[PDB]
Amino acid sequence: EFVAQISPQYPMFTVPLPIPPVKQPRLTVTNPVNGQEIWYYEVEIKPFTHQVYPDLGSADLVGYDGMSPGPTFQVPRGVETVVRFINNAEAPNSVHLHGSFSRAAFDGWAEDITEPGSFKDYYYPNRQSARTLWYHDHAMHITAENAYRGQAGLYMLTDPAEDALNLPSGYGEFDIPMILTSKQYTANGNLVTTNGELNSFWGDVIHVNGQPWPFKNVEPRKYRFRFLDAAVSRSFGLYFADTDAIDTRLPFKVIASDSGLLEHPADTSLLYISMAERYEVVFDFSDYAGKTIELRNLGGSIGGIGTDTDYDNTDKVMRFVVADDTTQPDTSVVPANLRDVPFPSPTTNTPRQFRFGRTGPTWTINGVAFADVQNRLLANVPVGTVERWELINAGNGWTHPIHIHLVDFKVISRTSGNNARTVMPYESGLKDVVWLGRRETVVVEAHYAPFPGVYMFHCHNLIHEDHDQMAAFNATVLPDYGYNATVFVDPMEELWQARPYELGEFQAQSGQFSVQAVTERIQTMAEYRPYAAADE
Template identity: 45%
Template sequence: MGQRERWLGLVKVAKASPPVLATTRHLGAFSGITSPCVYHSSSPKKVFLTLRQSFAVVLALVSGTLAKDWESPEYKWLYEFPLPIPPPKTEKFQPIIDPVTGKKIRYYEIEIKEFTAQVYPNLGPAKLVGYHGISPGPTFLMERGEEAVVRFTNHAKLANSVHSHCSPSDGSLYSPAKEEASLYGDVIHVNGQLRPYLRVEPRKYRFRLLDASISRTFFLYLEDIQHNRVRFDVISSDAGLLTGPQSVTELYISMAERYEIVLDFSFSKGQNITMHNTRSFAADIDYLHTDKVMHFVAGDNTVSDTTSVPSALRTVPFPKDKAGIDQHFRFERQGGSWRINGVTFADVNNRVLARPKRGTIEVWELENSSGGWSHPIHIHLVDCRVVKRVNGRSNVVFPYESQGLKDVVCLGPGETVTVEVRYAPWPGVYMFHFHNLIHEDHEMMAAFNVSVLADLGYYETQLADPEWRAKTEDPAAYVFNAVKSRIEYMAKFQPYNNVEEVESRLDAYWATKTNAPSTSSTASTLIVSTTPTSTPVSPTITAKPTTTSMSDDDKKKDDDKKNVSTTTTMKKKRGMRARRVDMEMPKRTTAAFRLIHI
């Protein structure tokens, strides 16, 4: 297949500094606002490395029943091995100059390949597939305002699909023998290490958490040696910093959700602090040690720490309040299949379930009628505001949800959640789905079409050409002059490069319309914290309007076809526009992403 050197979108990253816990998988800070952005690879019938944020709570196979202590071989080495810290990714060559903007473009290469890792100390090495043959994968550290191109080369035996849409996931779990419904794993691992420990100084630390499990939701809490709960501050969620720190003693986190916390070990000098997972939570099946996550071993030395967490972190660009419900989606299981409003993703004629107009705000009601399962809902392109919860979690929207924006929303058993979303800046057909990977793999997905505004009057360059697809590996393409030529050619197109102007045009457009929709409240403002941080790196063709007379149904289907010529997803993040591109990569092929950081 042809090489797909895609432009991911417009991304802002924070200034890099030595990480406290480096992110794994990839990226992290947008608009000066830390937020996990993850690349992951998928291939049939394999369990692949999950690339996670630093200190990501990662479960390949999680939990089981109390009637069985283990499904896997028993693991006896609780908190005996240190937490792995992924290495920073280094550039392949010197930066390349963008011929249009004059800015530096950094260039990285990632190799997907097989390797082995010693998971159980008493058993043989496990065979894995991942980035650069390490677990977890490397960390990208970048400064705000930088651009980067990341080229992926597939040296694995099977084809891989590489995409980035700021939501992580494992490869699918395949159990060919003795299959059973709702098979939960029994081993919790963090950054690839089963129940590790981390030595810390008696000071503040900032950690990034990601639940990269296949099917398990966590209810995390910290406990000292006297079994007292330890309080910590939640400062960031999927879409970046919250309005201010939220002091809590426990944290719900479902598959693909991300949070950042600040934990002060000065109150635990010389003690062990244990991170636990609450048992019997969200109907997930427990095993013997599914309540144990990891240890923090606090030193007894004296460390000067004069930092503090600011009481205000930023102004979050919430959508303006909107009355009523625009869309209701029922997530359920029918006849052994997972459906949204009775539709599976295989139903190509009916899977577009919503058609919000570009630049408008809609209120979506999400209902979980699937029984005892919890379902994290991931809506591509946009970030949402969680407005209300009923029939679950004590009917409470937690402050660490309400004080920020989300792209993954946990939907508990029997629960109904209301979210508010502004569908901007880009048009096109996008996906929303459960991030329980088993349900997702069984077609619990649907699409929505952000309609083109034919009279917007703004020209946009959007790359969706076969020229940028993956192609067979050519050693000559990896030398500096070839890389430089290719990147300079890509840069001349400058797609998705004027986000602020697009937003301004959309606001001006709807201001002239009757019953104009609300728009975002304000641009995000970052208040710089002095708290020690682990700084991360952290199209759709728009067709011309038709003049042919068509029925309303035909027009909708025609719009859906026009808005998607390839499977793509673009994601907005407060000044960041990251574009997801599904890239099928046969063995020994290469493909490249470009990140544009404004």
């Protein structure tokens, strides 16, 4: 069963699915090292209001470029980017590009904050396999509220070599972002804050791309859906159902996970997806012409995998209204062979063990909280080592989607105390988040490479994360390793810290924001060659 909705009654499935706009670079800067162009962006973090409930008041948000989701980046492999994330808001931020093997000082270390009235330049490599990344806040102990209030957006890394696959295409056309969130609203339509919540903030209103229970008109053909669970605490068990047969799950194909394409499409009628996980789905509406297809969420706390509270309407995600015919023929396909997945060389070494539970009210990793500076560094791993980590949730009363920064990993095994599931077919490839459901233990395998530095790992339930379920590992190198490692291993390195800005120089695009100043700043950053070790 389920619990009565708390948020005001919403006009279900009446508002079109919005698509976040593509974020365009301001300019490009020539890299003196290799003559390549670096794309430079400016993102302004600022407050804004959004009228979510038509007949009530508005909600207070804070977002990248004053929208939520933030605008969508689209970057081809091989093009380095620099993003100046400008804090013109009211609380600190720390931006993490989730899915990117960024250097430690460009990775969103929780203490590596930018204050209101400052910005930080983030230098990204964009060398990894094509994948759906996302960028979001990571500031220590205020991550849940910063993300909740709007600081998360999509970042698509593209590969022209994947074009020949002829998958459904066109951002906002047949390649649709599906960013899920779960929130709660007050009686006059503002957001209920996550502040004060120490267990989980489930939310009773399901959003896609910032919009409660939307609809979309689709043609009877194939669409690529890029699912991201950007919720604070809600995990999903997604399925598609004709409204005439609301319990009957319709088949689809999963084609990609966190780190990129699967080797082969996974035939799927139920998609488990927890916080921070990305799955790309191809759904074929051609068998459902003139029907309405509802994207729904499995009840009973994601079919017994989770512990999430279910409400009146959290079994509903959005509705697809399928036309009777196409307007152009569908020439897209879903190849049986997608890519060769670059799995790490397998090891037989005993896995490191990490236990995710609670120590009193505080969510901990092996009994440690992230606030504990003395004890939070829980592993030293020489760069280039392949390690298995055993990620343990002994509890039946909570679940944890675990995220390890820097790496892509393979999911080796999952056990369940409730015998509920093992490794899912769509977990066949490479991932960077893995869901420890009720009484589940998962072993992952990862190459801790290619860059040395101190990095985070944590549960990505943002309430658990803030209080205080995060730890660090150090990917280590020897004194003679080179690659300017000495200025790239410490995430708090002063060279890369946030800088104060004057609002007027930003608006006037002068001073610190003149073409010359941005150019010289980026060329100087490029000279340190932060990502050279990936080009061996």
